[PDB]
Write a protein that binds this ligand. Structure first.
Ligand SMILES: CCCCCCCCC(=O)O[C@H](COC(=O)CCCCCC)COP(=O)(O)O
Ligand SMILES: CCCCCCCCC(=O)O[C@H](COC(=O)CCCCCC)COP(=O)(O)O
Ligand SMILES: *[C@@H]1O[C@H](CO)[C@@H](O)[C@H](O)[C@H]1NC(C)=O
Ligand SMILES: *[C@@H]1O[C@H](CO)[C@@H](O)[C@H](O)[C@H]1NC(C)=O
Ligand SMILES: *[C@@H]1O[C@H](CO)[C@@H](O)[C@H](O)[C@H]1NC(C)=O
Lengths: 537, 538
């Protein structure tokens, strides 16, 4: 029970169980090590012959926790996991540019199935394809309706993926994680066909950083998603991310991280700082990049690492890119969990007032907004305990005072009201490029967090628990990849309306779904839309 | 997948034989402590339980990983989330937890008469279960050595289910329930192990941490009476990291305070019989209430909310007094420590950076019967020099925050490493003819910040990872001891392990080697503590 495949780069061996044949950790690019560290990936020139992917793939270097920032226990854990035994135990190395392919069983060079290409989210600091297993997701596609190929990729995070500033910029070494994603895609154009894939029936799916990534791909190179004269993908599914306004890669925040990253790495004062870092051994290296503030901190979503406009790969701030019609527009489904904020609001329990909230954004989030506007945006948000997230929970779930408020805010600005804003602009500049959006509520009443960020990965992606939300979301996605419309393919219980028609979205409870106005929290949404620019993070 | 089964006096169980080991997981040893039996001493089954499938994974007793009412906000949030029924179900955790696991070599019969190793898990009296202590590696080692045995790992109640104190608990006769679970389980073994191929007259009890402390408490129980039906329950003890823990009584100020708090959280305050309200509270609410108090993963650290406390019957007196008065069942024993016991415990309380601060911290949370003068004197036996502290012999390294190494050392010594020496000394005085062997584990030397830290023995010794000198020698020493009553008899050993009392020497075990050394390090600390053991009642 093993297989088999031969392709232009090489040939591969996979193991099939219960109707799915999976190849894990197939190489897609040169291992970005030695001098290739901190530089764009390169597709393999010379055929790599035969490798076993019977195994478990690697992960690129993780940043679960800061080695230099945060509370002391977290720093301690961050340093420890960084040691060689731990990385080895978990298979994490600079040698990460590999990918996973999972198929129905028996599929062949003529099978010509559509492609589902996943991008994991870890807030650009972590994540890997290791635990996203395609199986009953692919199983449902087979279980009825439409079979497909599943692709899960690995890409550089933290320092490896998204180091910033001056020096990186000159080298054209910006936004490597993005490039990794792009090169993976190109590999799909060339090689996926040997696997019985249909090229350019390719739909890209992402969550969190993955979702933000999907939009970034459409945006890449001023929106040209054309490889060898053919479109790289035909559709996009984004869960809980899309447009993110960021200051330029040349920017104060990015130059500073880079400056302390070096200082920690002892390449400082060297003539060529950048050149030097590729000098440094991996363990010392990981430790320096992870020195920065991390997601699991007070810093929260003011990420040390994210994509930043550089003007080639990422020519402009993403909101502007939409406005200027400089992205590849393709059919899309975009979603948010009802309570995206809550997880993010937990750590900064400092922030007990708008005046407090304001200073917080001003210290760390937006250097471009005056105290005047921010105070206005936040004020769009009530202090009322009832008004917060988890939404519709009354006086309950108030972890500390203002938590629900902050959660609503962090959740909105970044994701939920970020999404409609994308939708409105997308409707304006590319009307006639269809789109659908939804709200997840299947986890209502879960204490404190409600239907929180990344709840989907379980409920939808692994389909736990099995129920109305699972079958329904899946059917829609499965249909979408197969047909390019959520509603077409399989028979669907509720016809999911285009967002632009009546500005409606689907709201899915565990056992029910319904159609509602995507109009909530309008004044907050409105201030943001009118003012999206000052929120460049 | 081969099944195998055993008829025994209380029932029949079906187990599983894999790769030369037969395992029965989830064998009940006592009536479920639910309903009227929550917060009551364990009771043996009065009726045959029938035939049980033990082929699966067994349950755990309710856990207190993190506090629901104390500590950092994130921890509180997680502490509450763990308690929802969906997660409880997922981890097989409930009040119906009095079960044990049995593992034996394939082909064992009621005829076999093997030695029994009885394992008690440690979780600081707040957590832990037998679920993740599988004997296959240890057993595989014994079989390979020619000294096969039967492995028994128990569940016992922890936290508020097991160790709730206060006067009402005392009056009910319900103190130290978790110790009673362990004891009743020993009694089950005495009755029933022969059916499984085990010899009830050759039981060795072993534990780590709270389990270790628990081994001494078993020797201590009922004034040293370890006889059931006229025979000794165990013949030897192995203690890894912990032994004698001086404590204030079950109806003391700390204990009463914890109980009053739990009662208030549970909605039982002002009832005519509060301990009786507690039995009627819904499980989720009760769990939330017991876990309400300060947890081990907090600033309070090893000043535990739940622990064994003297009640006058089950535990007659504070444990140091018990040894002194020759009131424990003195059996051959092995006792040991990881070189750096306190490092893990000193991570959270990182505002404790000075002599004055350490003293304040102890006076506030730890020792209510010690003066500032006495504490300051004990603390001052520890240098402030970075080199002096723990992790030991690491020089200028590993100083997590200033004073961390000193605090780790103090925490390590009073609770563990120095207490062990004091115990050894007392026993030799009152029981000179009962042999003891001790050692210090250093196999993880150089590990950053923590060194050879608390519970490192679970990996190196219980699971034998990584395979090396340390694992082979210790396991072999332990296995011989289970088989013969001496760590040196049985399989041939590289280094003869001396009895402690001869020259007060111990084994220090490195990853690749072992050496004999004097148990006299940090003598001034030891001596103060030994001379003053009573003040440190927690
Ligand atoms: C080991 C836990 C994995 C199962 C979680 C079930 C989630 C999906 C399920 O369909 O929704 C829920 C499960 O419980 C939810 O309240 C949230 C729990 C998930 C968060 C876990 C961090 C289904 O519950 P129900 O409405 O009662 O059918
Ligand atoms: C998943 C890691 C499993 C290894 C456990 C190691 C047990 C002891 C080991 O044999 O020797 C230790 C392993 O590393 C230790 O320093 C500490 C690791 C344990 C910390 C776990 C949080 C060193 O052995 P060696 O390299 O042979 O000298
Ligand atoms: C919150 O604590 C942080 C820790 O970095 C510190 O910056 C600040 O004092 C607090 N922030 C606010 C807004 O109070
Ligand atoms: C303190 O010592 C007294 C004797 O003076 C004793 O009765 C009491 O129980 C002790 N208290 C604690 C907390 O050890
Ligand atoms: C340590 O900090 C805690 C807050 O977590 C505080 O309650 C306590 O008083 C402090 N102790 C010392 C000795 O500073």
């Amino acid at each position: 029970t093993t297989v088999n495949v031969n392709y232009p780069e090489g040939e591969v061996v996979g193991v099939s169980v219960l109707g799915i044949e999976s190849f894990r950790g197939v190489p897609f690019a040169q291992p970005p090590v030695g001098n290739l560290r901190l530089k764009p990936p390169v597709r393999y020139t010379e055929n790599i012959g035969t490798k076993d992917t019977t195994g478990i793939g690697p992960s690129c270097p993780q940043m679960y926790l800061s080695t230099g920032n945060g509370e002391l226990l977290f720093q301690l854990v961050g340093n420890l996991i960084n040691i060689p035994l731990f990385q080895t135990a978990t298979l994490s190395s600079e040698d990460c540019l590999t990918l996973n392919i999972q198929r129905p069983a028996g599929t062949t060079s003529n099978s010509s199935l559509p492609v589902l290409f996943w991008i994991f989210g870890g807030g650009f600091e972590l994540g890997t394809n290791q635990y996203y297993d395609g199986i009953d997701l692919l199983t449902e596609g087979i279980s009825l309706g439409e079979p497909f190929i599943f692709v899960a990729i690995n890409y550089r995070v933290g320092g490896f993926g998204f180091l910033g500033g001056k020096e990186i910029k000159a080298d054209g070494s910006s936004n490597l994680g993005l490039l990794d994603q792009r090169i993976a895609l190109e590999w799909v154009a060339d090689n996926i066909a040997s696997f019985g894939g249909d090229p350019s029936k390719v739909t890209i799916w992402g969550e969190s950083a993955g979702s933000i990534s999907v939009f970034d791909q459409m945006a890449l190179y001023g929106g040209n998603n054309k490889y060898k004269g053919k479109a790289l993908f035909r559709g996009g599914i984004m869960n809980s991310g899309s447009v993110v306004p960021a200051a330029p890669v040349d920017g104060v925040k990015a130059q500073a991280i880079y400056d302390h990253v070096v200082s920690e790495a002892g390449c400082a004062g060297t003539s060529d700082t950048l050149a030097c870092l590729r000098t440094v051994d991996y363990t010392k290296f990981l430790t320096a990049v992870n020195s920065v503030p991390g997601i699991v901190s007070y810093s929260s979503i003011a990420l040390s690492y994210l994509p930043r406009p550089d003007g080639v790969v990422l020519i402009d701030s993403p909101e502007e890119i939409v406005k200027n019609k400089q992205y590849a527009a393709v059919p899309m489904i975009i979603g948010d969990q009802e309570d995206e904020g809550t997880l993010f609001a937990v750590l900064p329990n400092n922030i007990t007032s708008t005046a407090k909230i304001v200073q917080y954004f001003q210290d760390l989030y937006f250097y471009n907004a005056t105290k005047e506007q921010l105070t206005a945006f936040v004020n769009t948000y009530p202090t009322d305990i009832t008004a917060g997230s988890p939404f519709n929970t009354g006086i309950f779930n108030e972890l500390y005072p203002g938590f629900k408020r902050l959660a609503a805010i962090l959740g909105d600005m970044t994701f939920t009201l970020a999404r409609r804003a994308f939708l409105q602009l997308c409707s304006e500049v590319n009307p006639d490029v269809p789109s659908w959006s939804y709200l997840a509520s299947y986890d209502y009443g879960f204490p404190f967090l409600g239907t929180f960020h990344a709840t989907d990965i379980l409920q939808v992606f692994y389909g736990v628990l099995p129920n109305y939300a699972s079958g329904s979301i899946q059917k829609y996605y499965i249909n979408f990849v197969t047909t390019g419309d959520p509603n077409k393919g399989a028979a669907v219980d509720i016809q999911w309306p285009q967002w632009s028609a009546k500005k409606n979205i689907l709201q899915i409870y565990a056992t029910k779904a319904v159609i509602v106005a995507d109009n909530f929290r309008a004044k907050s949404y409105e201030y943001l839309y009118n003012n999206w620019g000052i929120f460049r993070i």
